[PDB]
């Protein structure tokens, strides 16, 4: 069966790990715990096709570190994550997208824009700003909450669909 290497990028604290832990381990915990189980693999069925998801979480890596460069060049698709209550994380998306484009030497890389923490009443980045940005990039935009599980599976499955359209 086909294996998809999905890379999760974005500023520290946007919820890249919480999104991964929900998808793979079925839970959310607010407290940071680095001793949690190291599973990043899940067998799943998307649009009838059975596949294996391998999630490469860039959290905890220094920017420009070797492991981060390795994750990016082996990754087939990218989730570009910002938090809806973190303006700077949204402004940083352009930087993460340009970096993926450089490391892949491609102007057409499968990507999904993810607006995380959509359970928060606290909102400094509007849906329209994110929809206009994803439209200019020609990529899907998905609103998620790693806390309530809203849009989580949709964001990773939409990325797999983007990889398939590309191939």
Ligand X SMILES: Nc1nc2c(ncn2[C@@H]2O[C@H](COP(=O)(O)OP(=O)(O)O)[C@@H](O)[C@H]2O)c(=O)[nH]1
CB of 18 to ligand QY5, least distance (A): 8
CB of 65 to ligand QY5, least distance (A): 12
| One residue of 4, 6, 7, 17 binding ligand X per CB under 6 A | 17
| One residue of 7, 15, 17, 159 binding ligand QY5 per CB under 6 A | 17
| One residue of 6, 7, 9, 14 binding ligand X per CB under 6 A | 14
Quick check: 67 binds ligand QY5 (CB under 6 A)?
A: no
Quick check: 151 binds ligand X (CB under 6 A)?
A: no
* Cα angle: 76, vertex 40, 68; to 5 degrees: 55
Greatest Cα-to-Cα distance within the chain, rounded to the nearest angstrom: 42
The Cα–Cα gap between 140 and 55 comes to 19
Q: What are phi and psi of 57, to 5 degrees?
A: -85, 115
Q: Are 46 and 80 in contact (CB under 8 A)?
A: no
Q: Are 166 and 108 in contact (CB under 8 A)?
A: yes
Number of residues that bind ligand X (CB under 6 A): 17
| One residue of 68, 117, 125, 142 binding ligand X per CB under 6 A | 117
Place of tokens 């669909």: 161
Q: Of 3, 155, 164, whose CA–CA distance to 81 is shortest?
A: 155
Positions that interact with ligand X (CB under 6 A): 10, 12-18, 30, 59, 116-117, 119-120, 145-147
Q: Which residues contribute to the site for ligand QY5 (CB under 6 A)?
A: 12, 17, 20-21, 32, 36, 38, 57, 59-60
């Amino acid at each position: 069966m086909t294996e998809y290497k999905l890379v999760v990028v974005g500023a520290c604290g946007v919820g890249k790990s919480a999104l991964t832990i929900q998808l793979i381990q079925n839970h959310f915990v607010d407290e940071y715990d680095p001793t949690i189980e190291d599973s990043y693999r899940k067998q799943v069925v998307i649009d009838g096709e059975t596949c294996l998801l391998d999630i490469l979480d860039t959290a905890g890596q220094e920017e420009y570190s070797a492991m981060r460069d390795q994750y990016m060049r082996t990754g087939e698709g990218f989730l570009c994550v910002f938090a809806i209550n973190n303006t700077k994380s949204f402004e940083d998306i352009h930087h993460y997208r340009e970096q993926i484009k450089r490391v892949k030497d491609s102007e057409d890389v499968p990507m999904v824009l993810v607006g995380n923490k959509c359970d928060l009443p606290s909102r400094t980045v509007d849906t329209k700003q994110a929809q206009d940005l994803a439209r200019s990039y020609g990529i899907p935009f998905i609103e998620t909450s790693a806390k309530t599980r809203q849009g989580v599976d949709d964001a990773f499955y939409t990325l797999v669909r983007e990889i398939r359209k590309h191939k």
